Amino acid sequence: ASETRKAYTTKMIPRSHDRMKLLGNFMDYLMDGTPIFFELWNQFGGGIDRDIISGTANKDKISDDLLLAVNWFKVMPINSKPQGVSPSNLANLFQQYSGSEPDIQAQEYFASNFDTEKHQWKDMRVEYERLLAELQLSRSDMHHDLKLMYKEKCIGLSLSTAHYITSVMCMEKIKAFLASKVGPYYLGSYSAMLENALSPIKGMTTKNCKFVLKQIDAKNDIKYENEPFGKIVEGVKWVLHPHHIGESNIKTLWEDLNAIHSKYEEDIASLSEDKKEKRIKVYQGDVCQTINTYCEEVGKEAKTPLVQLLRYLYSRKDDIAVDKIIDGITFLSKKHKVEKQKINPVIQKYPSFNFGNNSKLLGKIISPKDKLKHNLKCNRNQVDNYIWIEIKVLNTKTMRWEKHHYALSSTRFLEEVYYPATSYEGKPALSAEQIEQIRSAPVGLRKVKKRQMRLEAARQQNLLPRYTWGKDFNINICKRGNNFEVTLATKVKKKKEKNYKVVLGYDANIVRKNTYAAIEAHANGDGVIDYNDLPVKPIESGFVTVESQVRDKSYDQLSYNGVKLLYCKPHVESRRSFLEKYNMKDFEAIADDETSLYYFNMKYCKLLQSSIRNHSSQAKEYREEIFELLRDGKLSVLKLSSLSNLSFVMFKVAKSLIGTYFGHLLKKAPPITDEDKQKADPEMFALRLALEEKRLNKVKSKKEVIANKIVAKALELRDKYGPVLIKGENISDTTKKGKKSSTNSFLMDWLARGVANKVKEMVMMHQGLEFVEVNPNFTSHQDPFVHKNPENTFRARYSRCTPSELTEKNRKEILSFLSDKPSKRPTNAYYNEGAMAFLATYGLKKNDVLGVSLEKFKQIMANILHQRSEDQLLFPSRGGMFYLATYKLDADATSVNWNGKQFWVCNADLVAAYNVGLVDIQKDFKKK
RNA sequence: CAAAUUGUGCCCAUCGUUGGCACGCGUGCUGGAUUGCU
DNA sequence: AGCAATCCAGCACGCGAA
Helix, strand or coil: CCEECCCCCCCEEECCCHHHHHHHHHHHHHHHHHHHHHHHHHHHHCCCCCCCCCCCCCCCCCCHHHHHHHHHHHHHHHCCCCCCCCCHHHHHHHCCCCCCCCCCCHHHHHCCCCCCCCCEEEEEEEEHHHHHHHCCHHHHHHHHHHHHHHHHHCCCCCCHHHHHHHHHCCCCHHHHHHHHHCCCCHHHHHHHHHHHHHHHHHHHHHHHHHHHHHHHHHHHHCCCCCHHHHHHHHCCCCCCHHHHHHCHHHHHHHHHHHHHHHHHHHHHHCCCCHHHHHHHHHHHHHHHHHHHHHHHHCCCCEEEEEEHHEEEECCCCCCCCCHHHHHHHHHHHHHHHHHHCCCCCCCCCCCCCEECCCCCCEEEEHHHHHHHHHHHHCCCCCCCCCCCEEEEECCCCEEEEEEEEECCCHHHHHHHHHCCCCCCCCCCCHHHHHHHHHCCCCCCHHHHHHHHHHHHHHHHCCCCCCCCCCCCCEECCCCCCCEEEEEEEEEECCCCCCCCCCEEEEEECCCCCEEEEECCCCCCCCCCHHHHHHHCCCEEEEEEEEEEEECCCEEEEECCCCCCCCCCCHHHHHHHHHCCCCCCCHHHCCCCCCHHHHHHHHHHHHHHHHHHHHCHHHHHHHHHHHHHCCCCCCCCCCCCCCCCCCHHHHHEEEEEEEEHHHHHHCCCCCCCCHHHHHHHHHHHHHHHHHHHHHHHHHHHHHHHHHHHHHHHHHHHHHHCCCECCCCCCCCCCCCCCCHHHHHHHHHHHHCCCHHHHHHHHCCCCCCCEECCCECCCCCCCCCCCCCCCCCCCCEEEECEHHHCCHHHHHHHHHHHHCCCCCCHHHHHHHHHHHHHHHHHHHCCCCCHCCCCCCHHHHHHHHHHHHHHCCCCCCEEECCCCCCCCCCCCCCCCCEEECCCCCCCCCCCCHHHHHHCCCHHHHHHHHCC
């Protein structure tokens, strides 16, 4: 029985200066009262002590010491009342409190790093005594009241809802103090302030409790018997990480070094004579060169191992073994990581004041039916583009409540649930008058006017479905400055069902046109593959393409990648003519009439970045170009950009260009603060902010649109077959230090988990759908519907191509794959066996195939493709599409007989999507 | 309780043919990544 | 090393009722 919430981010319309100021005063009164509740509950939590929690004592694994520590020892900003405690003196302070010494959990909690510059530990027990003294209440009575609170779940862990706390709760003195500090007791305002004060309290408390649990569990996984070895290895300063020595290649490096050392030792033992020092120096130089070459080789696929660390380890080769060295270094890295995990501070939340109907600040959108009643009782057009919400505002001047009306202007909200049926869908056909009105609106209001008129026409034509209002919408009024941002939240109920019938996987690639693929559960037709025991059938499989209808064409935002420059010729010609004045194969290599516009823009950004690096002293002179390249120009990043990964790469290189521009314009040593660069060129900083906001909007739109396409396909399959299952990838632990910096940057824009969260949220809104995450391990190579049934297949990937388009790089890669060399990667073995199968298919005589004269090889391939009546030839490729699948899983796959199997050349992405599906289908369907 | 001029936005070589399209908002802290000159 | 920013993700609660 799952549920979620929707929100339409309405916009407040000023009703009148007096009413607006009244609402602002009410908001300020509520906001200023929240910190009082925050401090009061800080004191209450500080008051906790043993003999109070020793009642029900209900808790999973939380030790009483950890609970007490969190209840009276928290990290808060330096500038706050409870100041006066240092980290060192935590153990004795806890010992004094409750009369017991710290335990492991409490010691770890106290032994938790934080940011001393901004935050600091706070006693949270002198605050309780301060509350007792200032309000002069007996400690016994306060203890009784707070024990009652805890018995009511009003303090500690797992607090009850704020409204319940306020309703349930020496009460006279507490209420008098609240009245002195906060306004008169009113349930709504008190509940709102208590909620907005407790939120950070309980949130950070639970987060830090689970953080301590994780830290103790991680430390229990630390061996600690390498601690002397850790100190030996550790003997400016930085932590040592496993990637600094080639975590896995260090064993081979040390084996080679041990062999060389054995040779050196046996040669020194014999041939005992002078000049030994020269040979030893020659031995040291050779080992140093070997270490450097090893680091150079290892730095091609990961971070380059540190040369100095390896030299230090090799010098101490007799005092520690290779496995001991690895254990010590991993122990040091793990200890450093565990000891830098900050504890979560407790900052004060900015109140939001959720206005509702049941138990919140009373308020409501009036109704559509009551809106019609109001428009009929009072002469009105009966149709308007605004929503009136009645809010029970507390008058600051006269301390009494009063209901006022305020206007919201969200067209989407009207389109979705508000506008009435007086008389996912499409759009109606407008009349003459409505079209004239749309054409008469100003340029900036044309789109919203068009939407409003289309909605009005839909109402006129009975094309607006009845929306069963229900009146269960929550209003969230947040006052930041002098303006409001009402939201109009709403609940959505799903009642999820487990009896699925389809599995709709999607690979969510980065740069290879993320695709989807569906699989039936109990198919009964021509093709029913018995995977293990469940009859399944490939339903279909296609790419996630979003259609933007230009005047006559239809572009794909996710993959358009820009125009091909065949129509942007004047811009490129002007840029070339201007640049010719100052001194070009690279320029022409990117200016082809088939090159995409965004690729050209990215390459130009990188070229300008390099030039500015070269011409560091004159970075300002190019600033105009940057503007003409990013905002002002018609062919600019802000004016023209798609959602394809190439576009995000272009934006990232633009941000890097701005960064290097600031660095070169502000270099002659105090740090270059953002303020200094802003003052040096406020226009450039404003442009950078504009790019950042544009990219944030760009990424949110991409997540939204991809989620829309996949969820719409899921809905289609549900309409056809039944409850669908998406099974999206669990892209976790990505962007590791072990990977190269370029790889980390490339994976950052993956947005795989963002898309997964968005589609999960959407699926929470549609009945029947559900989204689960499965392990992406080996999902990119398994052959669909045949892997795992007899056993794992793990076939390799190819790339079909004609002989005429064969390149030297392809031949070199193929020959390298043909090289029978031992490799630890299972992918290398898979590609080796695939290449062996390819050779056996046509008998290329690998020994005779690795010769020169690539033209001769092309001629031989053409002869082979002539003997066998085909069109192209396949060849293994590590980054190639066209995975070999046994079934026709594409609908465009080509049947080809490889050996005796009659495979279907599908596309790698579609088979990957299929693999992502049915990974744990048995878990989905139990025999019950 | 009347402003009837804007929810956030997204797409484009010819910004309109009424162009096409999407969307949970906030707050808070915690982990990985973007230049720069030795 | 002789130090300025920001983005991508991860969890904590409001969006109870009777």
